[PDB]
Amino acid sequence: GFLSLDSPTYVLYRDRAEWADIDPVPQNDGPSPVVQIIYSEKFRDVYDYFRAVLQRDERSERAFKLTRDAIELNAANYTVWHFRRVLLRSLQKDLQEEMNYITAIIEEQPKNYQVWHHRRVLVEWLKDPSQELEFIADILNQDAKNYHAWQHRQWVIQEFRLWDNELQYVDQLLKEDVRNNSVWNQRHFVISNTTGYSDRAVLEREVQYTLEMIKLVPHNESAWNYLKGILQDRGLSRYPNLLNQLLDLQPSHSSPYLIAFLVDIYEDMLENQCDNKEDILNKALELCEILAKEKDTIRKEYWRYIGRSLQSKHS
Amino acid sequence: LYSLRPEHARERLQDDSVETVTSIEQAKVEEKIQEVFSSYKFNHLVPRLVLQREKHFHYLKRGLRQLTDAYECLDASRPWLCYWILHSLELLDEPIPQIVATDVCQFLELCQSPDGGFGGGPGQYPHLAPTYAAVNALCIIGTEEAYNVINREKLLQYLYSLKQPDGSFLMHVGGEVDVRSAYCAASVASLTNIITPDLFEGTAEWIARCQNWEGGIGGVPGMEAHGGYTFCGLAALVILKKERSLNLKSLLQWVTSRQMRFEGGFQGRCNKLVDGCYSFWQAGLLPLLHRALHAQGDPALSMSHWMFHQQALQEYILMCCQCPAGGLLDKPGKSRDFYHTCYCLSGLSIAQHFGSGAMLHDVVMGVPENVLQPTHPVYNIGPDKVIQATTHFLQKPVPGF
Numbered sequence: 001g002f003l004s005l006d007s008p009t010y011v012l013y014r015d016r017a018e019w020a021d022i023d024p025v026p027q028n029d030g031p032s033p034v035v036q037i038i039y040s041e042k043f044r045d046v047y048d049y050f051r052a053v054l055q056r057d058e059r060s061e062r063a064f065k066l067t068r069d070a071i072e073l074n075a076a077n078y079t080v081w082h083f084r085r086v087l088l089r090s091l092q093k094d095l096q097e098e099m100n101y102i103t104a105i106i107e108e109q110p111k112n113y114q115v116w117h118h119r120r121v122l123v124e125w126l127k128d129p130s131q132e133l134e135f136i137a138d139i140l141n142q143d144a145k146n147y148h149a150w151q152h153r154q155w156v157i158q159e160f161r162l163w164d165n166e167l168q169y170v171d172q173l174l175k176e177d178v179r180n181n182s183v184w185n186q187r188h189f190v191i192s193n194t195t196g197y198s199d200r201a202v203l204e205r206e207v208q209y210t211l212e213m214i215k216l217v218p219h220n221e222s223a224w225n226y227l228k229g230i231l232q233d234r235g236l237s238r239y240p241n242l243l244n245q246l247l248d249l250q251p252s253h254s255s256p257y258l259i260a261f262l263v264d265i266y267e268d269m270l271e272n273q274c275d276n277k278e279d280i281l282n283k284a285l286e287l288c289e290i291l292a293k294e295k296d297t298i299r300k301e302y303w304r305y306i307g308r309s310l311q312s313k314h315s
Numbered sequence: 316l317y318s319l320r321p322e323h324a325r326e327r328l329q330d331d332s333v334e335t336v337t338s339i340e341q342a343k344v345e346e347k348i349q350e351v352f353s354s355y356k357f358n359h360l361v362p363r364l365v366l367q368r369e370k371h372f373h374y375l376k377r378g379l380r381q382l383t384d385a386y387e388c389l390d391a392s393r394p395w396l397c398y399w400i401l402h403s404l405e406l407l408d409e410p411i412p413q414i415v416a417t418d419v420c421q422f423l424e425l426c427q428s429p430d431g432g433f434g435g436g437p438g439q440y441p442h443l444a445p446t447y448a449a450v451n452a453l454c455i456i457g458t459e460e461a462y463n464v465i466n467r468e469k470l471l472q473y474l475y476s477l478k479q480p481d482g483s484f485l486m487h488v489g490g491e492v493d494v495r496s497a498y499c500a501a502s503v504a505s506l507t508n509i510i511t512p513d514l515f516e517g518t519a520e521w522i523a524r525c526q527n528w529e530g531g532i533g534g535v536p537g538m539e540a541h542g543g544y545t546f547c548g549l550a551a552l553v554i555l556k557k558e559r560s561l562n563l564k565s566l567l568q569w570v571t572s573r574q575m576r577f578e579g580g581f582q583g584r585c586n587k588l589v590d591g592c593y594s595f596w597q598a599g600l601l602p603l604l605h606r607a608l609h610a611q612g613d614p615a616l617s618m619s620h621w622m623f624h625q626q627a628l629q630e631y632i633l634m635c636c637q638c639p640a641g642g643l644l645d646k647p648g649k650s651r652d653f654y655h656t657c658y659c660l661s662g663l664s665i666a667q668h669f670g671s672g673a674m675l676h677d678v679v680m681g682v683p684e685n686v687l688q689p690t691h692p693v694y695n696i697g698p699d700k701v702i703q704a705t706t707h708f709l710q711k712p713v714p715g716f
């Protein structure tokens with residue numbers, strides 16, 4: 001008998017006969033309260049009653065239904081969530097019906113730590129990950145960058161080893177928004193945990209793919225950060241064709257990202273004993289000033305630091 | 316004013332004629348920010364960048380006593396409201412009447428668990444977020460009364476109950492793990508002097524695993540780099556003296572890339588929106604990185620400025636993040652709250668105050684009455700409060716059990 005907290009015929013717990021036996025325990029804020037919240041009548045009612053059943057550790061079906069109301073009033077109350085999990089195991093509740101419950105509440109408020117942790121506890125208990133990728137995909141369809149959703153997704157995939165169709169899902173979301181940095185992060189999570197980036201064919205496939213994206217949307221920083229991220233590993237100087245290939249986009253696709261990437265390639269060439277040390281250094285230093293004074297002034301302090309640092313290092 | 320310069324119009328987003336949810340939402344924001352920047356021009360007055368101290372003060376001193384039911388969503392984060400407010404009053408240079416201070420102390424006493432640590436309100440199970448907030452608030456107060464509230468033996472015991480074999484910490488018993496717990500733990504343990512030889516064994520290594528391909532740090536290994544988690548990861552490492560466990564250079568590039576060329580404020584993660592609270596979580600990283608690189612004897616570091624545009628950040632905060640009615644915010648059009656008031660103010664203070672050894676250099680945009688009290692980049696409470704607290708707790712021996 002779940003009388004909805006939003007139902008027009010919802011009645012306070014103090015006006016409920018099946019609760020008339022128990023006294024509500026009010027909150028002890030002290031004689032001189034600080035950051036004291038002027039609770040609503042409903043909030044106050046539900047919590048005074050929650051305190052009562054918790055204090056007496058009453059593991060009843062009535063207590064279980066009440067935590068649902070206390071959770072709906074404040075889904076961030078981790079104490080209530082704990083007791084709810086306590087009652088889920090005591091009353092031996094159908095955990096699949098609880099998955100239905102958590103699916104709904106997460107749909108309602110997806111930016112909450114407690115709801116996702118609770119869903120993970122249920123999936124662990126049932127050792128059943130079959131609804132996960134699909135549920136998460138529905139949340140990502142509403143907010144493709146929800147941090148908890150992506151975190152839960154990484155957990156399910158790693159825990160249950162569900163890697164097989166993720167790179168395809170990544171390609172899907174990248175088509176929807178090639179600027180979704182969460183998806184670029186997922187791309188790396190999948191590849192590094194499956195094939196890895198040492199497989200030259202993968203690396204080639206990834207660099208080529210990324211370059212095509214850069215060509216299409218030159219000012220998309222995610223594609224640039226991903227390019228830097230997968231090569232930066234072994235050292236950008238280790239790839240002699242790259243500098244050339246980027247220097248070509250100098251007129252057509254030349255955002256301050258192309259400029260900054262060139263300085264990065266140069267920094268690594270210097271540290272890696274390249275030909276024309278004096279020359280290469282001057283090019284890098286020249287770009288640092290163009291960036292500091294002109295192309296990327298918001299980061300002037302950074303680019304000057306890079307300039308100074310490069311000088312001290314490779315004079 | 317850097318934001319108001321003509322050449323600044325050139326910093327507007329360039330979508331390459333390829334619109335996506337990302338470019339559309341950013342453009343909406345830049346559009347709204349531009350209307351703010353140009354408001355002076357259209358109304359023909361001289362831009363007067365003023366921090367509405369008195370407005371912020373009434374809001375703060377009032378929220379410190381009571382709050383409307385709109386705050387029911389923060390009923391499990393009351394020690395946070397105390398910290399956010401007392402710290403905002405502290406940055407603004409407003410005093411805590413000894414009567415208010417004792418009241419706050421008594422409240423946090425009710426929030427403290429018999430098992431150590433503090434819960435989000437009287438009688439709530441202990442959690443690390445409100446434990447960090449409760450401890451920081453008591454340190455801002457800095458009285459012997461405040462200091463004595465904290466049960467140091469139960470606190471250490473609580474921290475051990477959360478410690479994991481892999482080096483991480485749960486946020487609370489039966490809860491989740493992410494970089495925040497490492498920072499919350501390293502903060503309260505260092506301030507109270509309860510760090511045993513093995514308490515943080517493996518913690519620096521676990522945090523290091525949170526650093527990804529972007530250079531920043533995610534909530535748990537594998538996750539996208541974020542400003543709130545990156546501050547927690549780096550600040551925790553600085554406390555543990557293990558900053559070197561991270562690739563400091565890739566992190567420097569990542570955080571500096573988070574400042575929005577147009578809006579001037581910081582975004583939380585690549586390709587997302589600017590937000591006032593990140594004036595602290597992200598910009599707060601620059602002082603930390605300055606100290607770390609300086610420890611490594613970096614010769615190219617500045618002797619007057621942080622490695623971010625202090626001017627642009629102060630302009631974004633002063634022009635775009637103040638609610639006329641008092642209080643600060645995420646961005647124009649957002650509602651004010653004590654969280655954003657605390658971090659917008661915290662970030663302003665970081666933006667105004669540079670210091671590296673013997674060097675000190677301020678940069679106070681707008682009227683000089685704008686200058687705020689300095690904030691310690693690791694703990695985010697006054698530097699004086701840190702020294703005062705640690706010195707006090709050092710008179711006590713580390714709990715042995």
Ligand SMILES: NC(=O)N1CCC(CC(=O)N2CCC([C@H]3c4ncc(Br)cc4CCc4cc(Cl)cc(Br)c43)CC2)CC1
Nearest residue numbers: 111112113385386388389392395444650651652653654655
């Ligand atoms: N407009 C209104 O009605 N109001 C204004 C807004 C207010 C909530 C608030 O200030 N809020 C909402 C909750 C935020 C909270 C949090 N909560 C859930 C998730 Br997922 C993420 C984060 C991240 C921000 C962060 C940071 C710290 Cl250090 C500490 C906290 Br406890 C948090 C704090 C700000 C309620 C009242």
Ligand SMILES: CC(C)=CCC/C(C)=C/CC/C(C)=C/COP(=O)(O)OP(=O)(O)O
Nearest residue numbers: 111147444495498543544583584587588590
């Ligand atoms: C000590 C302590 C408790 C520190 C807190 C650090 C902090 C603020 C972390 C952020 C957590 C998070 C899930 C952000 C994404 O939200 P979002 O998608 O709504 O915002 P976004 O688009 O700017 O990333």
Ligand SMILES: [Zn+2]
Nearest residue numbers: 590591592645
């Ligand atoms: Zn914010």
